[PDB]
Amino acid sequence: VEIPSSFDSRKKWPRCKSIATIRDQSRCGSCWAFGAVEAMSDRSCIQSGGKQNVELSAVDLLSCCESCGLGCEGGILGPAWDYWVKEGIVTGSSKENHAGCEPYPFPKCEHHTKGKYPPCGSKIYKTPRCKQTCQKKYKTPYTQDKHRGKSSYNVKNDEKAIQKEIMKYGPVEAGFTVYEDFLNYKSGIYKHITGETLGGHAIRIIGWGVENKAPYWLIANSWNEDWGENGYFRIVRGRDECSIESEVTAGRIN
Ligand SMILES: *C(=[N])C1([N]C(=O)[C]([C]C2=[C][C]=[C]C(Cl)=[C]2)[N]C(=O)[C]SB2345B678B9%10%11B6%12%13B6%14%15B%1272B632B436B94(B%10835)[C+]%11%13%14[C+]4%1562)[C][C]1
């Protein structure tokens, strides 16, 4: 195929509402789980021609995947996709919308930025327990609300391979290194200038573009819609900026 200079998953597959949804992981180190259920929600819709149009549950993955790390303390990407393939994941929206089988138990909050929600602060919740029961008002049993994938894989550390993967199969999960200057991000194309490493983060790459010739990836963060560019940010593309091209994980439903 021929890679266009820009691409936006939200515009190619506008029926799939999840693609344009920005979630909030709250006072929980569950970024690994959010980039996963987000992109799986997207891919379930894309690769099924719109048939599954759902919001997969972040708390189901977070709480039940023992091989994925330590829940709100952090986790690993590849295993989250293996869990989706082997056990599947039920539906579940944010806490506020309280929809689907298992909605998120934690409230929106501001992640080192100004806005309408309360500050998150530094305190971290304990990982919720693996319930395996839907909320009472949801009319399907847990076991049967499960959405499974068929494969899971890493994507080659190559810009063009990542681009081809996104355009054909949909948004991907990716890890990158967080430096202190990322916490002051409001807008623009980000790149590490100042600050020391605070860890890694896991997000959803949904596209790319170019602004006055500067190439970037377009990425959905999980710190709610008040953060960055309406919940999204942009980061230098093509230089493995903060290892943005090195920890790409995805999977297919068929
Ligand atoms: C979010 N929210 C956070 N982050 C996270 O989780 C991360 C993701 C990633 C991964 C990989 C790479 C990258 Cl760049 C990113 N993670 C982390 O940090 C990890 S934590 B842990 B692991 B091993 B496993 B379990 B898990 B835990 B520790 B050890 B390590 C084991 C234990 C949070 C912030």
- The range of the structural domain enclosing residue 137 comes to 1-254
Amino acid at 65: C
Q: CA–CA separation, 21 vs 212, rounded Å?
A: 27
Comparing C-alpha atoms, which of 212, 215, 175, 172 is closest to residue 191? 215
Cβ atoms of 174 and 249 within 8 Å: the answer is yes
Q: Is the CB of 36 under 6 A from ligand 1?
A: no
Cβ atoms of 152 and 81 within 8 Å: the answer is yes
Q: How far is the CA of 200 from the centre of ligand 1 (A)?
A: 7
Q: CA–CA separation, 151 vs 75, rounded Å?
A: 20
DSSP characters over 210-222 = EETTEEEEEEE-S
Q: Which of 126-143 are b and which e, b meaning 16 or more Cβ less than 10 Å from the residue's Cβ? A: ebbeebeebeeebeeebe
Cβ atoms of 224 and 230 within 8 Å: the answer is no
| Pairing state between β 214-220 and 197-211 | antiparallel
| Pairing state between β 189-190 and 232-236 | parallel
The residues near 210 (Cβ < 8 Å, ≥ 6 apart) are: 5, 6, 216
Q: CA–CA separation, 68 vs 71, rounded Å?
A: 8
Q: How far is the CA of 53 from the centre of ligand 1 (A)?
A: 29
Q: At what angle do helices 31-46 and 77-86 cross, to 10 degrees?
A: 50
Number of structural domains (the chain) is: 1
Here the CATH number for the domain that contains residue 146 is 3.90.70.10
Method: X-ray
Q: Is the CB of 246 under 6 A from ligand 1?
A: no
Q: Is the CB of 208 under 6 A from ligand 1?
A: no
Amino acid at 185: Y
Q: Is the CB of 92 under 6 A from ligand 1?
A: no
Q: CA–CA separation, 233 vs 216, rounded Å?
A: 10
Resolution (A): 2.2
Cβ atoms of 248 and 155 within 8 Å: the answer is yes
For CA atoms 246, 125, 179, 118, give the dihedral sign.
positive
Q: CA–CA separation, 70 vs 67, rounded Å?
A: 8
The CA dihedral of 9, 148, 155, 53, to the nearest 10 degrees, is: 0
Catalytic positions: 31, 201, 221
